[PDB]
Design a protein around this ligand. Structure first.
Ligand code: ATP
Ligand code: ATP
Ligand code: ATP
Ligand code: MG
Ligand code: MG
Ligand code: MG
Ligand code: ZN
Ligand code: ZN
Lengths: 558, 174, 189, 377, 641
């Protein structure tokens, strides 16, 4: 009765807005032509539904369990009627593939965070924003089994149900395959014609900034099924929309005796909104050629990177040269001539070494700033690990291995321990790492480029001594670095004023938006000043001196 | 009116603009002195200048682009759930600027939304204003909502709270 | 300025009491003013005061009645509305109709407090019962007022038979909200 | 409503080694040292069961402390069906369990000590704490335990002592004084040279080292801790470091002050560790929740902590005492039991100079390996 | 019958109580309903006064009577709010004699008791049940059962055929309420000597959740009940009212205080009133307490605003006393001994949850100190790995431990006050450069000074203006909270130019200092030190609530920095190290080892090279693998060219 009325209402709503019908038709046509596969899903905007009918909008927002399934059935009926497949297949006929729904638009007080989710928001549609910390393995889930009875020559089927698969509760169906027909004939399971869907459980953690002072972060579990199975990885920021639910007996059954613990609550995900390379167009290639023809482009590219920094122009040139690397030769004898440049910086304190590292990190396609001083997190080189109790061996890749065909920006190279020194020597010399520990034998490529900074041993660079003396690494390590740069902090009055003013500017620079200087606090997922840069005294600064050739008076805008 | 601090401040907000003329000597308007202002160039101007430039020109000097506080996102947010919307973050003078916008462009679509939002917010404003305290021995929600009040709403709330408090004090005075 | 900030475009409860006390009330005098000096007030009639006999009911302004009660020279006659039976009848009337307001006197809140404080032994009914009935009436009126605030518009509003104290309570909020809505509507045209 | 009767002086005294089957269900007096203790819990004193088939409610019973009440047949419905505990109206009693172990001295040469479990009912809980020597008079009971039978392989019964009275181990306490004695002390204090007599009367068996006697007497008597508006804290304890040639009557004086001091703990530099000086974590057999033990410094609060062969202690252990020396508190973080413990005790330490002898020419800095901070303290 | 009578009694109590002229509870209920607060707070004194029998019944069997009180409250609320809502919650206030936590025993089972303690841990909100919809597996019979939190419910075992436990819960038509578990520890004062603090589990529901945090003294009114986990039961408390020791009048008082013309001097006086001298350290500690205004940039590079200080002097200087006072005064503070704790104690450590066996992250002292101040003592004894961990933590204020099964990160916005023993390099000048301010405390041997300190200490022992020259800890703490949460001042353009000129003058001052021709000055100043000079002026501005920092703050900050860091940094040699290294290399052939003590005798005792030049050269040589340290550095072995 009510189910039919709601199905009819959603059918009328879909008829009114032709965009969703067009989207369904487009998905179906793309699937048919490509016979890589578009999922059966449609994204609706809550604003349009609110405009069309307030009752249905409020029902979806407050009573999703009773209002969502009718919408899914209406969409499935529309798709089936619109379908024009002439000849289906045994896989398609028996497949349990209804059409799912996802929601976009503006939420009211339902746009919450993992900390704000309390018991008053249960059985309601919510939008949770946070950070992924855990990601369980992808596993298949049984939702339909088709059997064959040879004697009667008929195909039977049976449907299963679980608390994490349907918004509306039903009697649990144990995963026991029927073995005999009602008439008594023996059945044989047809595995190829059954239906299995994927299943993944992830845990979303509150964003650290929003966490109240002196409070640990709170997390909420999320369940994703079918197409939304492999879309997030740990550490990513997501905005998951789903229905908050409570599962299990929660100690209410007489078997349990705690009588104090509460029920288990999760979210049934409906959609996930996330929170390298740029495809070159036809005229971008023309632009790059135009710049290439200009017989001054090397200086332009060199000084475009890190324009703020004063001096050290040769370092910028060498850093660009490193970024673009050199051809790598593979001889027929298996010999491998290295074709990746390496750079090491050594100098007194406060010479923008970290600034140069940051700029190469920002401009480099790949980079990992794993400092050499106790690199907690990702190790500098690969090293197997085992669990404390289960002893689960596993090869954990280090920074060097995670930069294949890229760059690794080590920091504070002078703080390395003997283990790291020995590992790095082999890594650079051979360009590959072969692990032969804990019964694990494997080879992992490490072709990359290394840039590192290293302060002196006495805290200040001595000119009278060789660079190999001001640094305390053996010749084996230093020889691997193709180019070694020694930089000293020189004091010049004009330079001092320039640096002072440039640093001062930022402090008085403010977060524009609220009373200047006071207590300081994506729209879509699917998705010629462009090339050149207008001069900015605040940022570039020294870049003008670069084209002026060390002349402050020079006003040659570069 | 003329001598009204709240009215004066509201006119001081920055609205987007698009110059469609080529005027020299107006460099200081954009960001630098002594540089002619090209045409078809976007810049941010205070309202007290943008309004006059738009009205006075055959062809106005300026063409006011759609502001950022009246975009479709804000309209949808207002229509969805007026009470929980935080107007203070959007703009501290939302209602005065809105009224000025409707008067300037005489748009009959924003008026309905603004009126409904004001009515719905006033319901909760009165709900919170009438809830006083009792010292029986001899607020968290109130503070949470109070931080989301525009300047005009804050003034109305203060006046209503003072009236209610005075009446209660007189009524229960010994 | 010449007038405080809170007294602009509204009233104060003390002024409301001042207004309420300007009305007549019936009292039982305890002296014999009638002859066989004398009052010559200018704002109020002085004939009644000059002609009063003990235990014989007469009419005088509420302010003068309270002044006499201060010296214990008269006994105030509690109005007919204040009695319990009338209060139960009015409560039932309010409950029966969830849309209209009762028809109590406009000064049914100020007079109640003034009499409950100054004259606590003149009533013919228990004081606590009267206080409870008045509280119930006030609560029902508050509910109805809250429900009726959802119909503010830019044209006008009607609140038949609403006491002066409640109107004074609601004057700032209603007036300001209606003014803002009217300004928006006028700008729209 | 109940006044328990406790027997004080049982003539027959037994030990944890000589208890046999003949002593079952009889009054026995044993001596031992407490090495374990559990929290205080309420235990049912009169239970009232009910049925599940008919729902009938059984009458009152008495709950023995060692075995739980078992019913295998009803009386109202007279069926062997399941049962349950009901009758929310009940009267409870306190219940605690401690592990009593034989005194190390009493144990014959190099034999394993024998331990039993003692059950303390209402009015007896929190009457003793770990590390005490006590005498327990109670009923030596036994009961059937399935786990023991399954493990050993023979019909063996668990045994436990239901305590009836606990006493500490002349009289009851020498430190306790009477009103009559308090008058004697005032008379003695009036002596003109009482201080000299106190110093002389301290370690008389040792001839010389009057400076040692003065310092140690001052440490024993102690100071007056002071606090200023809760903003400034001044320690009242006095710390004395003893340093000199090998044979000088150093350890013997510490042994003497151990006896004389009210609450004293004796630890040697070699035989000590930070875990044993701060606290140790155990698992409660009842609640299965991790608790925290007391350390050597904690056990000697408001007393004296004597350390012998101080120079021999390792650096980490010597750092563990820095906190107690000046901060007068020890901080612990183990097994999510982060808390701060109170340790206000004076420390008397004895050591020999580095190299085995004190070179009078060189200063105290090089003579002993202790760092400048601790030396200053 | 009886239940209806009790409900009517409660209704009459609520509707009839009145002290002078105002119906307290009626008006309170109306006000609470208006703001969507479904609760009622009742003072037990009023209940006793109105009718003693009602209180007698309430205290006799609270678990049975309290739900009826909630029902009556709900009925009255519906009568008062709806013209002819969830079950309301009852909160109780009482003034009965407090029962010590350690003294709770079986005698107080199922009785209302009042106690006090300190919260040590709080859980995350659970979801208890209040109205369950149940359907039978076989015959599919729909039914509903209501549940009340108080115990003196489980799914039916017999269907209302169907076997045991035939009912399942329909979760789409049920209602739930919040629950939380807290732990209460007895007050330190009441703990008997030689014993240990005892803990007690507690439970709160609905509007009593998220009302306290660990480390807050609280007073609890609740039911002492027992829940089954020989025949023993686990005690616990059911909370009914929370009153923790933690407006406009105080704003007026604070504003008047800020108007005092010597606010800076009084605040510097309140810092350690009991410690004599060390005025510069006192001012630096004041600046650290107030801190610096936060800076955030749209690009992503947000500058630090907090302040850290280093106290490095000889023993007997009251550094620890200063740290203790700083810990006590600040609203949020953690006092930690460097050697007492470890890497786990500070920053954070990755551990595993025993109950669930999942790798999780637990914060250290800095995490627990987020938004406050951490006073680290004995910086020297702390291990080098912990020191570098602290280096990173102060560098980014976000301890980055996100690996090993999880990828979670925590914020550590904190101010570090470090007291370190004298160096007499492990204490390399780099970590010092990280510190904003460096102080070397040295008492000068002036007879007047010695007598003054002696008199001060004797006055301490034999022993409070607080009349315009000092303020107690409570007022100062509230002051710090107000100033840190309200005002975030910023410097001024003229002050900015003046400070730039000041740095120029400092560089020129070194230029004057370097009268030497060949010798090179170590450092005039670093850019990090320049940033350090700023953010203390904002501290002074926030101290006085000044929206813009004027030149006065600039000169004050300049003097404070000059009196601490430049002199301490200043408080040839490399060429000598070259000769020492050459001699050591020449003396020892390859493979020949000589005792480090023997080398010290050869050179240090001979005085040809000072000891500070021995360790430096030895470290420089060892780090290059040319030499090796053996026997804890007591034997030196050459290992190549
Ligand atoms: N050429 C330069 N132009 C502008 N600023 C500079 C230049 N060289 C150094 N700086 C300033 O030096 C400051 C210090 O930079 P950074 O902390 O990265 O120094 P570092 O020498 O790499 O440090 P460390 O000695 O600790 O390894 C930066 O704020 C930058 O402003
Ligand atoms: N002044 C003295 N009078 C009496 N006996 C003394 C005296 N000095 C030393 N002795 C005796 O010297 C012996 C030395 O043993 P004791 O336990 O006293 O310390 P120790 O082993 O010499 O000390 P250390 O730990 O410094 O090696 C003891 O028997 C003590 O009786
Ligand atoms: N001016 C002073 N007024 C009072 N006490 C002072 C003063 N200067 C030093 N002190 C001393 O400081 C002591 C407490 O601080 P403490 O000496 O432990 O600090 P510290 O020097 O850091 O210690 P250590 O270096 O030994 O670890 C008090 O006992 C005390 O009398
Ligand atoms: Mg650096
Ligand atoms: Mg000895
Ligand atoms: Mg100290
Ligand atoms: Zn039975
Ligand atoms: Zn059934």
């Amino acid at each position: 009765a009510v189910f039919g009325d709601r199905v009819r209402r959603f059918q009328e709503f879909l008829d009114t807005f032709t965009s969703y019908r067009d989207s369904v038709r487009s998905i179906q046509v793309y699937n048919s032509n490509n016979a890589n596969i578009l999922p059966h899903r449609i994204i609706i905007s809550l604003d349009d539904l609110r405009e069309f009918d307030r009752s249905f909008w409020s029902g979806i927002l407050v009573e999703p369990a009773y209002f969502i399934p009718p919408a899914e059935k209406a969409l499935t009926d529309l798709a089936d009627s619109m379908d024009d497949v002439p000849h289906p297949n045994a896989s398609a006929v028996s497949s349990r593939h209804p059409w799912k729904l996802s929601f976009k638009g503006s939420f009211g007080a339902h746009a919450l965070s993992p900390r704000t989710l309390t018991a008053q928001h249960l059985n309601k549609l919510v939008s949770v924003e946070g950070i992924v910390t855990k990601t369980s393995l992808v596993r298949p889930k049984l939702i339909r089994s088709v059997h064959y009875a040879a004697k009667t020559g008929r195909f039977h089927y049976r449907d299963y149900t679980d608390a994490t698969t349907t918004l509306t509760t039903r009697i649990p169906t144990p995963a026991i395959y029927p073995t005999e027909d009602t008439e008594g004939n023996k059945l044989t399971t047809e595995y190829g014609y059954s239906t299995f869907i994927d299943h993944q459980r992830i845990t979303v953690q509150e964003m650290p900034e929003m966490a109240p002072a002196g409070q640990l972060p709170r997390s909420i579990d999320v369940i994703l099924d079918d197409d939304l199975v492999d879309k997030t990885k740990p550490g990513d920021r997501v905005n998951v929309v789903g229905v908050f639910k409570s599962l299990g007996a929660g100690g209410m059954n007489q078997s349990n005796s705690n009588t104090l613990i509460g029920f288990k609550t999760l979210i049934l995900g409906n959609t996930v909104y996330p929170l390298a390379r740029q495809m070159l167009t036809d005229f971008d290639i023309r632009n790059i050629n135009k710049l290439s023809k200009k017989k001054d482009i090397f200086d332009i590219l060199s000084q475009s990177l890190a324009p703020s920094i004063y001096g050290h122009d040769h370092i910028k040139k060498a850093i660009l040269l490193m970024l673009m690397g050199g051809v790598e030769k593979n001889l027929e004898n298996g010999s491998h001539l290295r074709g990746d440049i390496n750079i090491l910086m050594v100098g007194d304190p406060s010479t923008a070494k970290s600034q140069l590292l940051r700029f190469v990190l920002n401009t480099a396609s790949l980079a990992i700033a794993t400092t050499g001083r106790g690199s907690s997190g990702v190790g500098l080189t690969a090293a197997v690990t085992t669990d404390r109790e289960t002893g689960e061996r596993r090869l954990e890749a280090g920074a060097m291995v995670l930069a294949d065909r890229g760059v690794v920006c080590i920091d504070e190279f002078d703080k390395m321990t003997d283990v790291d020194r020995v590992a790095i020597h082999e890594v650079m010399e051979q360009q590959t790492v072969t692990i032969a520990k804990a019964g694990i034998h494997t080879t992992l490529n490490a072709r990359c480029s290394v840039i590192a900074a290293a302060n002196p041993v006495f805290g200040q660079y001595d000119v009278n001594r060789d660079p190999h003396q001001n640094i305390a690494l053996p010749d084996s390590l230093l020889s691997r670095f193709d180019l070694l740069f020694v930089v000293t902090d020189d004091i010049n009055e004009i330079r001092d004023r320039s640096i002072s003013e440039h640093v001062l500017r930022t402090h008085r620079y403010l977060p524009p938006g609220y009373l200047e200087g006071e207590p300081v606090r994506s729209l879509a997922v699917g998705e010629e000043d462009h090339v050149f840069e207008k001069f900015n005294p605040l940022l570039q600064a020294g870049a003008k001196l670069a084209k002026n050739k060390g002349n402050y008076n020079g006003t040659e805008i570069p | 009116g003329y001598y009204d601090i709240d009215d004066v401040l509201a006119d001081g907000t920055e609205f987007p603009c698009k110059f469609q003329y080529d005027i020299p000597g107006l460099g200081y308007l954009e960001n630098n002195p002594g540089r002619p202002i090209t045409k078809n160039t976007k810049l941010s101007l205070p309202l007290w200048l943008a309004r006059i430039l738009a009205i006075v020109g055959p062809v106005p000097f300026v063409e006011l682009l759609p502001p950022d506080m009246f975009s479709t996102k804000v309209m949808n947010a207002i229509k969805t759930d007026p009470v929980a919307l935080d107007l203070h973050s959007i703009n501290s003078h939302f209602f005065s600027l809105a009224i000025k916008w409707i008067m300037l462009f005489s748009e009959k679509e924003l008026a309905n939304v603004v009126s409904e939002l004001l009515l719905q917010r006033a319901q909760e404003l009165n709900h919170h204003a009438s809830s006083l305290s009792i010292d029986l021995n001899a607020n968290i929600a109130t503070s949470t909502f109070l931080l989301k009040l525009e300047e005009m709403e804050k003034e109305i709330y203060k006046k209503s709270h003072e009236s209610y408090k005075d009446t209660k004090r007189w009524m229960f005075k010994k | 300025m010449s007038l405080p900030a809170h007294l602009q475009q509204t009233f104060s409860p003390e002024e409301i009491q001042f207004i309420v006390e300007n009305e007549p009330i019936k009292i039982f005098p305890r002296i014999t003013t009638r002859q066989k000096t004398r009052w010559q007030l200018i704002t109020t009639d002085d004939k009644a005061l000059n002609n009063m006999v003990a235990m014989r009911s007469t009419e005088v302004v509420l302010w003068i009645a309270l002044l006499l009660k201060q010296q214990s020279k008269c006994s105030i006659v509690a109005p007919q509305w204040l009695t319990t039976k009338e209060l139960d009848r009015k409560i039932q009337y309010e409950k029966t109709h969830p849309d209209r307001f009762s028809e109590l006197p406009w000064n049914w809140l100020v007079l109640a407090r003034i009499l409950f404080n100054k004259a606590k032994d003149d009533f013919h009914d228990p004081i606590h019962e009267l206080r409870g009935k008045i509280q119930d009436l006030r609560e029902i009126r508050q509910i109805k007022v809250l429900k009726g605030l959802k119909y503010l518009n830019e044209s006008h509003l009607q609140l038949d038979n609403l006491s002066l104290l409640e109107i004074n309570e609601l004057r700032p909020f209603i007036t300001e909200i209606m003014d803002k809505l009217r300004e928006i509507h006028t700008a729209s045209l | 409503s109940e006044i328990h009767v406790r027997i004080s002086d049982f003539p027959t005294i037994y030990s944890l080694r000589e208890l046999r089957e003949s002593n079952l269900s009889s009054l026995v007096r044993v001596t031992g040292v407490v090495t374990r203790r559990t929290g205080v819990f309420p235990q049912l004193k009169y239970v009232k069961f009910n049925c599940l088939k008919c729902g009938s409610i059984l009458g009152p019973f008495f709950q023995d402390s060692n075995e739980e009440i078992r019913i295998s047949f009803c009386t109202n419905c007279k069926s062997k069906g399941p049962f349950r505990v009901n009758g929310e109206k009940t009267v409870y009693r306190n219940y605690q369990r401690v592990t009593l172990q034989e005194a190390p001295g009493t144990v014959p040469p190099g034999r394993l000590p024998r331990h039993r479990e003692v059950i303390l009912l209402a009015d007896l809980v929190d009457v003793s704490k770990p590390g005490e020597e006590v005498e327990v008079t109670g009923i030596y009971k036994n009961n059937y335990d399935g786990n023991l039978n399954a493990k050993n392989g023979f019909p063996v019964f668990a045994t436990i002592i239901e305590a009836n009275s606990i006493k500490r181990r002349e009289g009851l306490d020498v430190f306790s004084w009477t009103e009559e004695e308090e008058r004697e002390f005032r008379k003695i204090s009036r002596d003109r040279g009482i201080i000299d007599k106190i110093i002389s009367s301290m370690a008389p068996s040792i001839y010389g080292h009057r400076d040692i006697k003065t310092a140690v007497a001052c440490s024993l008597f102690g100071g007056v801790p002071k606090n200023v508006n809760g903003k400034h804290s001044i320690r009242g304890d006095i710390n004395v470091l003893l340093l000199g040639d090998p044979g000088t009557a150093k350890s013997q004086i510490l042994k003497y002050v151990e006896k004389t001091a009210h609450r004293a703990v004796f630890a040697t530099g070699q035989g000590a560790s930070a875990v044993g000086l701060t606290a140790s974590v155990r698992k409660d057999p009842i609640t299965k929740e991790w608790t925290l033990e007391g350390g050597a410094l904690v056990l000697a609060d408001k007393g004296v902590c004597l350390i012998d062969e101080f120079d021999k202690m390792n650096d980490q252990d010597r750092t563990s005492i820095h906190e107690a020396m000046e901060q007068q508190s020890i901080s612990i973080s183990k097994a999510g039991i982060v808390t701060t413990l109170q340790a206000r005790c004076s420390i008397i330490a004895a050591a020999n100079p580095n190299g085995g002898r004190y070179n009078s020419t060189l200063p105290l800095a090089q003579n002993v390996s202790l760092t400048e901070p601790i030396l200053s303290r | 019958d009886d239940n209806t009578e009790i409900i009517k009694s409660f209704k009459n109590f609520i509707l009839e109580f009145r002290l002078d002229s105002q119906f307290i509870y009626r008006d309170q209920l109306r006000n609470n309903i208006l703001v969507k607060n479904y609760s009622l707070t009742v003072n037990m004194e009023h209940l006793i006064g109105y009718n003693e029998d009602i209180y007698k019944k309430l205290s006799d069997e609270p678990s049975d009577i309290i739900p009826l009180f909630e029902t009556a409250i709900t009925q009255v609320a519906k009568r008062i709010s709806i013209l002819s809502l969830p079950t309301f919650q009852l909160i109780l206030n009482s003034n009965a004699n407090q029962i010590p936590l350690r003294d709770l025993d079986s005698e107080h089972v199922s009785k209302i008791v009042r106690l006090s303690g300190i919260i040590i841990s709080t859980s995350v909100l659970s979801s208890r049940a209040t109205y369950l919809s149940i359907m039978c597996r076989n015959c599919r019979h729909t039914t509903s059962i209501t549940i009340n939190n108080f115990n003196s419910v489980s799914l039916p075992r017999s269907c209302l055929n169907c076997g045991p436990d035939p009912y399942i819960i329909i979760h789409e038509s049920s209602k739930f309420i919040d629950q939380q578990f807290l732990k209460l520890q007895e007050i330190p004062e009441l703990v008997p000597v030689g014993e240990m603090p005892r803990n007690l589990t507690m439970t709160c529901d609905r509007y009593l959740t998220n009302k306290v945090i660990p480390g807050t003294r609280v007073t609890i009114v609740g039911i002492y009940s027992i829940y089954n986990s020989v025949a023993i039961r686990t005690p616990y408390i059911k909370i009914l009212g929370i009153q923790s020791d933690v407006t406009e009048e105080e704003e007026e008082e604070f504003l008047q205080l800020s108007r005092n013309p010597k606010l800076y001097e009084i605040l510097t006086n309140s810092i350690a009133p009991s410690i004599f001298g060390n005025e510069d350290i006192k001012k630096a500690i004041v600046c650290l307490l107030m801190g610096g205004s936060k800076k955030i940039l749209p690009d992503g590079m947000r500058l630090r605003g907090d302040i850290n200080v280093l106290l490095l002097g000889d023993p007997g200087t009251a550094k620890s006393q200063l740290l203790k006072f700083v810990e006590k005064v600040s609203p949020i503070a953690v006092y930690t001994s460097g050697k007492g704790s470890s890497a786990a104690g500070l920053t954070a450590s990755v551990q595993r949850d025993p109950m669930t066996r999942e790798f999780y992250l637990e914060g250290g002292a800095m995490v627990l100190a987020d938004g406050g101040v951490v006073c680290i003592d004995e910086f020297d004894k702390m291990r080098d790995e912990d020191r570098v961990a602290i280096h990173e933590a102060m560098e980014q204020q976000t301890i980055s431990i996100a690996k090993a099964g999880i990828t979670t990160v925590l914020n550590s916005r904190t101010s570090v006050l470090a007291a370190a023993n004298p160096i007499y390099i492990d204490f390399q000048t780099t970590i010092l450069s990280r510190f904003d301010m460096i102080f070397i405390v040295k008492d000068d041997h002036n007879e007047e000074r010695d007598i003054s300190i002696a008199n001060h200490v004797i006055n301490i022992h034999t022993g409070q203006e607080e009349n315009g020259s000092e303020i107690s800890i409570e007022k100062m703490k509230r002051y710090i909270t107000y100033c840190r949460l309200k005002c975030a001042p910023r410097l001024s353009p003229q002050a900015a130019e003046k400070l730039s000129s000041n740095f120029v003058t400092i560089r020129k001052q070194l230029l004057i200092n370097e009268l030497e021709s060949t010798e090179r000055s170590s450092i005039p100043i670093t850019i990090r030190q320049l940033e350090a000079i700023i953010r203390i002026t904002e501290s002074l501005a926030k101290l006085e609530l000044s929206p813009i920092a004027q030149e006065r703050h600039v000169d004050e900050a300049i003097r404070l920095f000059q009196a601490s860091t430049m002199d301490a940094a200043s408080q040839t040699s490399l060429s000598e190290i070259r000769r020492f290294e050459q001699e050591l290399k020449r003396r020892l052939p390859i493979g020949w080892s000589t005792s480090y003590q023997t080398l010290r005798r050869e050179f240090v005792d001979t005085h040809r090279f000072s000891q500070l030049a021995l360790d430096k050269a030895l470290y420089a040589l060892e780090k290059h693998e040319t030499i090796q340290l053996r026997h804890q550095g007591q034997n030196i072995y050459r290992s190549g060219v």
